[PDB]
């Protein structure tokens, strides 16, 4: 599964600076979703990849940023 990283507390995306390959997004995506995760910067938000199917991604039904 894939999807935008989301702050569980605030409901909002993680902003990045460098489009495409991005080590920040990479590390945050693995930390949140696990060592197998990938991630890159797409339209200036962190997009996580190789997520487990049950992974919770953006948007949170309840919480807008």
């Amino acid at each position, epitope marked *: 599964k894939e999807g935008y990283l*989301v702050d*569980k*507390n605030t409901g909002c995306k993680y902003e990045c600076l460098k489009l495409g390959d991005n080590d920040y997004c990479l590390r945050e995506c693995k*930390q*949140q*979703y*696990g*060592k*197998g995760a990938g991630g890159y910067c797409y339209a200036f938000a962190c997009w996580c990849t190789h*997520l*487990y199917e*049950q*992974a*919770i991604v953006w948007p*949170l*039904p*309840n919480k807008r940023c």
Partner: antibody
Amino acid sequence: QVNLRESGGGLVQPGGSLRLSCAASGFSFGSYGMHWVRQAPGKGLEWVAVISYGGGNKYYADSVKGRFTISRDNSKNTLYLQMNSLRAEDTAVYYCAKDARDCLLCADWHFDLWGRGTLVTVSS
Amino acid sequence: SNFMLTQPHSASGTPGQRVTISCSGSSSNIGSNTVNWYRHLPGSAPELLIGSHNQRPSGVPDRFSASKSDTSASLAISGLQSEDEADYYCAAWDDSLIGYVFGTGTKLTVL
């Protein structure tokens, strides 16, 4: 060969603070996120906190937020729970549990390893 | 009182026979996400009985069957032993609140 053991439990007055430890043996500590769960007297289990496998991200129960701070040392293979501004409602037995894997926000959470538990009591 | 999945206050059984422990819940926890089963032997470490879907390594005697239909889930214990009497909990991830919800707990007694 594999177990978790809690220490640091004790008796403390309100407003005071405690630090609980969990020693991990037999498995790779840094590959799994870790939880604190508690059982209050006359009640059942309640999930307290979680920290990611690398210690980067941590989530707390609404009850404990800002009072409790979860940390870990993957070099010493130990987990830490810092309990600040303690209340009488925080009286409980605390268990450190091991997440089956590394996904912090996921709907499949289950804890396949538990410790001996340590007794934290807060009296008037 | 935090929100909890609802289990019977107690269950009883006879040795070498079968007992069922019920876990009731709603959509956004059960009927959405998987359900887990733990057993807590008072004084010692709680144990993982079942999860996603089932069941553990090690203590997996079978004897322990995980069943789920929509909003209601159930654990089946077979070939009961005197040593089987412990508090039994169910747990499931609730979808909002976003978090991990524990059952009220069920004490089993072997006769």
